[PDB]
Short mmCIF file of C-alpha atoms in Angstrom, two decimals:
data_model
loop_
_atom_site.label_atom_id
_atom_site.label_comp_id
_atom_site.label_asym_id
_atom_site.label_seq_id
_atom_site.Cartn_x
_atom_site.Cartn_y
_atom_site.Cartn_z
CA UNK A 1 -22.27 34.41 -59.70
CA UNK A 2 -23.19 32.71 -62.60
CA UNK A 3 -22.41 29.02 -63.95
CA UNK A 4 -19.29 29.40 -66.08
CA UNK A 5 -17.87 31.82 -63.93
CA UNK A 6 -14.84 30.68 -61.55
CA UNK A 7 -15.99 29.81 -57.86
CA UNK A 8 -15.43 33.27 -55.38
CA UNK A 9 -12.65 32.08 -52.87
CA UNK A 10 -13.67 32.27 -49.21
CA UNK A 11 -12.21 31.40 -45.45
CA UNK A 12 -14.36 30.48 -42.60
CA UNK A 13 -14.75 28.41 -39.34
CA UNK A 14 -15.92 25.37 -39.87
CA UNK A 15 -17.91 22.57 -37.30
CA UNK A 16 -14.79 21.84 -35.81
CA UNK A 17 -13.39 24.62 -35.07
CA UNK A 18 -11.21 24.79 -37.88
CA UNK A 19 -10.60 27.70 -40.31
CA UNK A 20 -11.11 26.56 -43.74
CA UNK A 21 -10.60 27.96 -47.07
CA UNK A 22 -12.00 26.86 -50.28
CA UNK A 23 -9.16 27.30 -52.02
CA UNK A 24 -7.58 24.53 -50.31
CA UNK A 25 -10.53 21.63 -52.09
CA UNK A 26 -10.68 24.06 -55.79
CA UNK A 27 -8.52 21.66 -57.84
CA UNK A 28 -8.68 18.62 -55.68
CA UNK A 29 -12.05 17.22 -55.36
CA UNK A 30 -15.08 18.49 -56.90
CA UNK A 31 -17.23 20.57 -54.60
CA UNK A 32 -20.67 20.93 -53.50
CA UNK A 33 -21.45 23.92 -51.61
CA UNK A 34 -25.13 24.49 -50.69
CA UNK A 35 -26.74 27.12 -48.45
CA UNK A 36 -29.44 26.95 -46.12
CA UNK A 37 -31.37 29.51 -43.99
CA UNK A 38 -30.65 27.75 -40.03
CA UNK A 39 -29.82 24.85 -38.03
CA UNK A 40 -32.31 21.95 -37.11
CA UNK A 41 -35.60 23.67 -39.44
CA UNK A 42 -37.85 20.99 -41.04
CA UNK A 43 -36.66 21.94 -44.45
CA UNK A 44 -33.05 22.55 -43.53
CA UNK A 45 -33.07 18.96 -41.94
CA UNK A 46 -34.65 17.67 -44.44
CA UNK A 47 -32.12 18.76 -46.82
CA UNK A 48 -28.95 17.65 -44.33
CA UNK A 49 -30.59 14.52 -43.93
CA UNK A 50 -30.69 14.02 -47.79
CA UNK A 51 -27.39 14.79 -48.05
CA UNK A 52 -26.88 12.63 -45.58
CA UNK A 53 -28.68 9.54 -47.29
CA UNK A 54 -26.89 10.09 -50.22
CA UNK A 55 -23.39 10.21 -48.92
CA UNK A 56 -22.45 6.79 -50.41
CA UNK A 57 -23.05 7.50 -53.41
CA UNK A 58 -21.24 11.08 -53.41
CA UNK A 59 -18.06 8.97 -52.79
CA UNK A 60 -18.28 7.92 -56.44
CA UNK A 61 -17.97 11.32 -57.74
CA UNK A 62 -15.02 12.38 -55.73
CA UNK A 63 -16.78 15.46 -54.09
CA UNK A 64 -16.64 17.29 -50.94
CA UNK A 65 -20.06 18.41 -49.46
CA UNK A 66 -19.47 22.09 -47.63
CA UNK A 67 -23.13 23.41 -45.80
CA UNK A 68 -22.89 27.16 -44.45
CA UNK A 69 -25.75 28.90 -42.55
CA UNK A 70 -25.61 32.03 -40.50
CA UNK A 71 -25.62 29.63 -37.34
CA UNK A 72 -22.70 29.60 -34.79
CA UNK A 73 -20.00 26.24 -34.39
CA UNK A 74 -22.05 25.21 -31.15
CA UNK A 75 -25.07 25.10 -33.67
CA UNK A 76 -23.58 23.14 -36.14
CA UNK A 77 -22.12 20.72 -33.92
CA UNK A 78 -25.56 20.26 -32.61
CA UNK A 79 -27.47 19.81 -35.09
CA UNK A 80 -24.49 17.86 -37.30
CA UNK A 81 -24.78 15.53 -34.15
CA UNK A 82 -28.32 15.14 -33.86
CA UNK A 83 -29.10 13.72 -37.57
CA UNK A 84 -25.41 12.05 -38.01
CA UNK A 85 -24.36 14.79 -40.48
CA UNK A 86 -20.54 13.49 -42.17
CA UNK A 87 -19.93 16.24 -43.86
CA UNK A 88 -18.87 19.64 -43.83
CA UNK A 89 -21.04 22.94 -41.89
CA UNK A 90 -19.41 26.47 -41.94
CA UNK A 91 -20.67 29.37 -40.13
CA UNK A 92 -20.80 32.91 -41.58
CA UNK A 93 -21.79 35.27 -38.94
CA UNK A 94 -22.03 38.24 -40.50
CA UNK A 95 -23.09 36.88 -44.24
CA UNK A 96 -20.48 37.70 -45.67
CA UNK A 97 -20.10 34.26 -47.87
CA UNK A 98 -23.65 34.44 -48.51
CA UNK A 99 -22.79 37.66 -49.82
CA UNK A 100 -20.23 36.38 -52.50
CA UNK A 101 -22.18 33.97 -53.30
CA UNK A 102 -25.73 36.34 -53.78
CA UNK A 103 -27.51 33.87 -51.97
CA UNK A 104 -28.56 36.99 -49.34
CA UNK A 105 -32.02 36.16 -50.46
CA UNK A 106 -35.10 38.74 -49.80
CA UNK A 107 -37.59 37.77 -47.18
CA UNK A 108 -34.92 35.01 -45.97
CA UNK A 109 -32.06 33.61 -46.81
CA UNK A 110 -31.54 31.78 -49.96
CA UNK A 111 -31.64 27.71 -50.12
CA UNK A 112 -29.22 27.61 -53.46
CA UNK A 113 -26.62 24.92 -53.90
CA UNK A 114 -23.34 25.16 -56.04
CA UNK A 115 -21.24 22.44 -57.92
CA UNK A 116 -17.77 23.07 -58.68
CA UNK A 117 -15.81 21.37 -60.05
CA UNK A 118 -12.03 20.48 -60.50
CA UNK A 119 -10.98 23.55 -62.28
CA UNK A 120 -12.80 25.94 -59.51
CA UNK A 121 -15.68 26.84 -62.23
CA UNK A 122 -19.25 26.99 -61.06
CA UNK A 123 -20.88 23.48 -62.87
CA UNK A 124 -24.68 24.26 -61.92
CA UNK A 125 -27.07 26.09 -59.63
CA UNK A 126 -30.04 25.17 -57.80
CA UNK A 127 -32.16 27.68 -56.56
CA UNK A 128 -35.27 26.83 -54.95
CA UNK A 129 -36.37 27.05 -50.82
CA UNK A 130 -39.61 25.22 -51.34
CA UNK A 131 -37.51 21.89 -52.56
CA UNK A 132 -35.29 20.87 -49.72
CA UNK A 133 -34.87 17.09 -50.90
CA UNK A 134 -34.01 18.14 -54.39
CA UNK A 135 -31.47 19.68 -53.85
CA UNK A 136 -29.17 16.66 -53.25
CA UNK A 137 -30.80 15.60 -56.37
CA UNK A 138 -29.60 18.37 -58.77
CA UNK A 139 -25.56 17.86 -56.97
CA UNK A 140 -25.70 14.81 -58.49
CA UNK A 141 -26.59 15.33 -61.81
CA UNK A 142 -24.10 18.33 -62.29
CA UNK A 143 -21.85 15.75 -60.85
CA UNK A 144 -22.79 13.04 -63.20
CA UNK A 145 -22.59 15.53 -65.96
CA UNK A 146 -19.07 16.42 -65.07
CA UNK A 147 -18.04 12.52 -63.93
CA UNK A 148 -19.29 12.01 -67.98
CA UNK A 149 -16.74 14.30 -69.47
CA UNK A 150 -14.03 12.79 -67.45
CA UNK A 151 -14.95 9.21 -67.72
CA UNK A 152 -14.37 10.22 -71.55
#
């Protein structure tokens, strides 16, 4: 997975107990999809909570915010509860999106966020565990990037 390359397709529960499937936001919003080792960490919250902050401003850049962790629903409910998450969580049980995305990781699981945008192509990576915060950070400047070529 590589930027350039078109976004893998995937279906999983999400939060609510809903299935969803990526293929049903590729084309209609721009997405951010960012993975995080577990539910309710320090870093992991500190990246939600981020998101979280920033959520406001993500409106402007018509974008849908998707988190996925190896955590259960229960555990995303939770912890989506606790810090007032709005968007998105998805559970993948047996890491199988992880997996598609190669963000398996080594001695954990990878904290690497996606942009996609409209035409389902992969925008920008951002790689990094010790930077929770940031990553909100780089989403929005892929996302400015790409709001700049449509602008004009």
């Amino acid at each position: 997975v590589k930027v350039g390359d078109k976004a893998p397709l995937f279906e999983g529960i999400a939060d609510n107990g809903e299935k969803i499937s990526l293929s049903d936001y590729i084309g209609k919003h721009n997405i951010v999809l960012y993975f995080y080792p577990k539910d309710d960490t320090p870093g992991s919250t500190r990246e939600a909570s981020a998101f979280r902050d920033n959520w406001d401003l993500l409106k402007d850049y018509d974008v849908v915010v998707i988190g996925v962790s190896s955590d259960d629903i229960n555990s995303h409910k939770r912890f989506k509860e606790k810090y007032k998450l709005p968007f998105i969580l998805v559970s993948d049980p047996d890491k199988k999106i992880r997996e598609l995305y190669g963000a398996k990781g080594f001695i954990l699981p990878a904290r690497i966020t996606f942009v996609i945008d409209k035409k389902g192509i992969i925008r920008h990576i951002y790689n990094s565990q010790m930077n929770p915060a940031n990553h909100v950070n780089e989403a929005l400047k892929a996302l400015k990037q790409i709001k700049e070529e449509e602008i004009s």
